[PDB]
Structure formats: C-alpha cells, structure tokens
Amino acid sequence: HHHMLTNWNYQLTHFVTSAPDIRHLPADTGIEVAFAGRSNAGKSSALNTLTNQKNLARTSTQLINLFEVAEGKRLVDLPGYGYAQVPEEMKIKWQRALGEYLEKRLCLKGLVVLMDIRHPLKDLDQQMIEWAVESDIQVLVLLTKADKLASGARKAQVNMVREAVLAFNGDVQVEPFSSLKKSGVDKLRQKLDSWFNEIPPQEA
C-alpha cells in the first residue's frame, strides 16, 4: 500500500473549540485552513454546506471557531469583517488581529476568502489576500451567491476577479460558489484536500 491524495470526509467535521483571540488558540501544530470574509458574504452558509451541518459554528461576535476534519486537521472560522457601526479603535484592533493570525499561525496552510460575486474585492478583502500571500499562504477566493447571476454574467465576474488577483504576489485561485444551489463544493473540497495533503514533516 502506497501514499495517495486522500479525499477527506468533510461531512464528519465537528466543532472542537472557540477562542476569543490567538493567544487562546490550541497548539500551533497540525494543519489549519482558515475561512474569512465580510459579514453577510455567506461564510457560515458555505461551512454549513461543506459539512452538511445546519449550524456548524453553534451560533446562538469576535470569536474564532475551530473545527476538526480529523486529528490535526482543522478548519478555522475567522470572525467576519466590515464592522458596521463600530468605533474606529475597535475596527483597527479587530482588523489587525486577522492579520496577526495570518502572519503568525505556523500551522496555517490555506486561506479561503469568501466574497459576494456581485461585489468582490471590497473592504478588507484585498488586505486579507495580501497578508496571506506575504506569509506564503495559498488563497482560494470563493465568489459566493453565484446563483444570483446568470451563467454569462457569472463567468464574466469570475474572469474579472481572476485577472485582478494576478496583482498579488502569490497563489490565488478563484471559483464561483453557491451554498443555495450546492455548487462549487467540489472545488472547495479539492482545495482543502490539496492543503491537508501537506503533512508537517516533524509530525510524519
């Protein structure tokens, strides 16, 4: 029996813990893939769709939610940005905390940035991609709510964003996604499988 690319079962992903900040994250070991986006972009719906769970994050918030796909393989749900009607001091603090996670989390292997296909690359979207590429993290951009566009317009948006992300000095993949129509889940699973194939040498 020889090594092969594993297709992990994301429907067995389960909640393990939350953290109020990076100082209270679990040990910086294994593999993490992070998810981020503007509030309301569709991040919780995408995670719910990927894992076939109705309310994966157990929401009843700046909490970081962590989920295990398997031992040592975690999805990290970063609190949505934008911060409607928030004081400038808190906004800067919360934005910096996202950057600190991307730059200092040694077990981080990929970042999924979710953004509405109709309004991509707004608010902290570009800064999140830039921080990831500076830290040698591969990025998957999911253009969410892709069911709101007809096929021609959908492809035009995907192409526009693919052209735009060439300006980042790193590896940025762009895919349309719809939680509502359960479309694009395959592209997400393929990216996750590629990232969870990269076992830390000191743990293998």
Binding positions for its own copies, rule: CB under 8 A: 1-9, 11, 52, 146-151, 154, 176, 178, 180-186, 189-190, 193
List 148, 155, 186, 199, residue binding ligand GDP (CB under 6 A): 148
Residue type, 37: G
**Residue 6 vs 61, nearer CB to its own copies:** 6
C-beta of residue 192 within 8 angstroms of C-beta of residue 33: yes
Draw the binding track, 125-144, toward ligand GDP (x: CB under 6 A; -: no contact).
-------------------x
C-beta of residue 28 within 8 angstroms of C-beta of residue 77: no
List 134, 147, 171, 193, residue binding ligand GDP (CB under 6 A): 147
List 10, 34, 44, 56, residue binding ligand GDP (CB under 6 A): 44
Residue 157: both structure tokens together: 């948006």
CB of 131 to ligand GDP, least distance (A): 19
Contact call for residue 42 and ligand GDP (CB under 6 A): yes
Number of residues that bind ligand GDP (CB under 6 A): 17
From ligand GDP, its own copies, none, interface partner of 43 (C-beta below 5 to 8 A by class): ligand GDP
Contact call for residue 80 and ligand GDP (CB under 6 A): yes
Query: Beta strand 14-19 with 108-116: parallel, antiparallel or unpaired?
Result: unpaired
Rounded CA gap, 100 and 71, in Å? 25
The three-state secondary structure class of 65 is strand
Residue 134: both structure tokens together: 């500076």
* Residue 140 CB partners (closer than 8 Å, separation 6+): 110, 111, 112, 113, 172, 173, 174, 175, 187, 188, 191
List 13, 138, 157, 179, residue binding ligand GDP (CB under 6 A): 179
C-beta of residue 100 within 8 angstroms of C-beta of residue 16: no
Binding site for ligand GDP (CB under 6 A): 37, 39-45, 59, 80, 144-145, 147-148, 178-180
